[PDB]
């Protein structure tokens, strides 16, 4: 197993471990270069595609996957996430060992890259053969192989860029950076796009601010121009951007919440300090997990309805009508798009709110149990550091953590779900999922910045 795959592990390229720690300014520069490369690849279409007119059942796995259909980033960050969860499950099921020796973790990284590349090849083959990019029989072996090679090398670039970020050149991981970059790109596009669409009422810009300026300059600077620019229905609004800024501000405010535990040291005396237990204890993992669950359920419902239509169970799981849920569990798990949608079906809005809050709370608690951030898992860190709580005994470190951390995780789940629901209700551009992910990732970057400043 490990012995026979180690020579297969070493073939893949690896990022050189930096000789000296990289400062924050040029860390930001390298992160900007990495996201620029990812964005440029997101715009270049694959070669050999005859038709991009298909179903694309994973349309909702695009904000959390940083995927753009038909381009070099067809798969987005799916190889990285798949390899990460595969390795975490393998380590937790004791087939392999991450270890602590540099050789052990180097082999772990090499095998993670190997499994990510295997997943990349598998996804590319599935995408090619299952009818996307055109008929695989019509494209031929040469075109199908060329598309598979393009997707393979694009995935190799994604893993290389993520490894570049993680080895110390960037500000985090490829997953968070690419997700936040896609969300911010979407919001800025819907704010400032020069794209124009004509529906019989002349030229009309697709970006909100550009449409505002165009209308104010053209239509006699009328109050009707401002009313349309703020309450436009066929294109992005100015009220949608105002609600996006408002949700940004509120999520920032609630991301700044923390429970500051006064901790001292019983090993190195004089190391008074603070342990911040954030209200958003699991930063955006509830969003990622909830979006993945809902989107996977959507894919399952679409697959069942397409093949096994008419069955009562399939209809209850979801009714579809491009597609969007119209009935069933998939509908009740779908955000109400407009205020009129909320008004016509209050029951759907209530069920969506309850499901979002409960799922976010459940995923937050499950993640603090899984990822090693449980109260017991933090009490182990307190014990094997000499750290105790200032006004509490050393034998009571776990009980205070048991009081704080589970409640912090659950209520962070509720707060995050409520923020996403509020953003979805207000019509915020970027959506609740996108806005929350973007704010949490930029806050991770900001907290890395303040950590580096404190180290100075």
């Amino acid at each position: 197993f490990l012995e026979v795959i180690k020579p297969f592990c070493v073939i893949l390229p690896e990022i050189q471990k930096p000789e000296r720690k990289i400062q924050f300014k040029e860390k930001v520069l390298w992160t900007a270069i990495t996201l620029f490369i990812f964005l440029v690849c997101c715009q270049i279409p694959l070669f050999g595609i005859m038709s991009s007119d298909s179903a694309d059942p994973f349309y909702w796995m695009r904000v959390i996957l940083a995927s753009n259909r038909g381009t070099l980033m067809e798969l987005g960050i799916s190889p990285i996430v798949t390899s990460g969860l595969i390795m975490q499950l393998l380590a937790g099921a004791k087939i392999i060992e991450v270890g602590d020796t540099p050789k052990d973790r180097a082999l772990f990284n090499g095998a993670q890259k190997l499994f990510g590349m295997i997943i990349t090849i598998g996804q590319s083959i599935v995408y090619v053969m299952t009818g996307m990019y055109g008929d695989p029989s019509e494209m031929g072996a040469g075109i199908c192989l060329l598309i598979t090679i393009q997707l393979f090398v694009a995935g190799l670039i994604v893993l290389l860029l993520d490894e570049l970020l993680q080895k110390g050149y960037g500000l985090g991981s490829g997953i968070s950076l690419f997700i936040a970059t896609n969300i911010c790109e979407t919001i800025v596009w819907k704010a400032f796009s020069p794209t124009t669409v004509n529906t019989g009422r002349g030229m009309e810009f697709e970006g909100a601010i550009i449409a505002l300026f165009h209308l104010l300059a053209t239509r006699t600077d009328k109050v009707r121009a401002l009313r349309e620019a703020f309450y436009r229905q066929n294109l992005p609004n100015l009220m949608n951007l105002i609600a996006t800024i408002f949700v940004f501000a509120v999520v920032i405010y609630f991301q700044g919440f923390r429970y500051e535990l006064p901790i001292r040291s019983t090993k190195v005396r004089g190391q008074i300090g603070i342990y911040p237990i954030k209200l958003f204890y699991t930063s955006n993992i509830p969003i990622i997990l909830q979006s993945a669950l809902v989107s996977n359920l959507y894919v399952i419902s679409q697959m069942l309805s397409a093949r096994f239509s008419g069955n009562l169970l399939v209809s209850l799981l979801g009714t579809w009508s491009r597609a969007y849920p119209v009935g069933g569990l998939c509908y009740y798990l779908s955000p109400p798009e407009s205020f009129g949608s909320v008004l016509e079906d209050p029951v759907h809005a209530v069920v969506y709110i309850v499901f979002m809050l409960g799922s976010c709370a459940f995923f937050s608690k499950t993640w603090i149990e899984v990822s090693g951030s449980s109260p017991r898992d933090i009490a182990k860190q307190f014990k094997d550091q000499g750290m105790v709580i200032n006004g509490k005994r050393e034998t009571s470190i776990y009980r205070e953590l048991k009081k704080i951390i589970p409640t912090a995780a659950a209520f962070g789940g509720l707060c995050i779900g409520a923020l996403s629901v509020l953003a979805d209700f207000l019509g915020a551009i970027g959506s609740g999922t996108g806005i929350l992910l973007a704010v949490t990732i930029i806050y991770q970057y900001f907290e890395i910045f303040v950590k580096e400043q404190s180290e100075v």
Partner: peptide, 10 residues
């Protein structure tokens, strides 16, 4: 593939 909170299209 759609199994689950996993994210591995198709």
């Amino acid at each position: 593939a759609x199994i689950x909170x996993x994210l591995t299209x198709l």
